[PDB]
Design a protein around this ligand. Structure first.
Ligand code: HEM
Ligand SMILES: [O-]
Length: 154
């Protein structure tokens, strides 16, 4: 699959708004993921004890993690599909160290789309959401191919 340049520009225009406060966006995305799909929280040995949204919001380590995730994803999106180098280390850690199924990558993709739809209606109308879904689907398709190369079913 391949995105057009116009689609990439819709992705990068909303990502520029995320970058006004990457930490706050990361907190919202993790809270949405863990509330919608609680099983995903069990994969985090440092955070699986958190019981409420208040505790998640107050966790400085979770905030730092959210900044790491969104900055890594942002660097992948800015490559506009030419992300082989960035996906190598990420696929290896997520397949072998963290053991994150493709289904859970689908869940965090849904959390990202929900938070952008809520915060950024000015840059996340239907065409922009479609472009972001295509970019995240491309990311998951290429991660899934690397998972298989690495020996992990996904
Ligand atoms: C957009 C998708 C994702 C991106 C870009 C991403 C990125 C990252 C990065 C950059 C790190 C730190 C370096 C590393 O270990 O590779 C990390 C750590 C981690 N990721 Fe992900 N991740 C994603 C999705 C997920 C999902 C869906 C889960 C689990 C449901 C997950 C579980 C973990 C865990 C458990 C760690 C280690 C956390 C810690 O140090 O406490 N990741 N991720
Ligand atoms: O993560």
């Amino acid at each position: 699959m391949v995105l057009s340049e116009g689609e990439w520009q819709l992705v990068l225009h909303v990502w520029a708004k995320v970058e006004a406060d990457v930490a706050g966006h990361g907190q919202d995305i993790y809270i949405r993921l863990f509330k919608s799909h609680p099983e995903t929280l069990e994969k985090f040995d440092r955070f699986k004890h958190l019981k409420t949204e208040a505790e998640m919001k107050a966790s400085e380590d979770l905030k730092k993690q959210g900044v790491r995730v969104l900055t890594a994803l942002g660097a992948i999106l800015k490559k506009k599909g030419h992300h082989e180098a960035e996906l190598k280390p990420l696929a290896q850690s997520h397949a072998t160290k963290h053991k994150i199924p493709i289904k859970y990558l689908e869940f965090i993709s849904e959390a990202i789309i929900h938070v952008l739809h809520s915060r950024h209606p000015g840059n996340f109308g239907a065409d922009a959401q479609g472009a972001m879904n295509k970019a995240l689907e491309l990311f998951r398709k290429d991660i899934a191919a690397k998972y298989k190369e690495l020996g992990y079913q996904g």
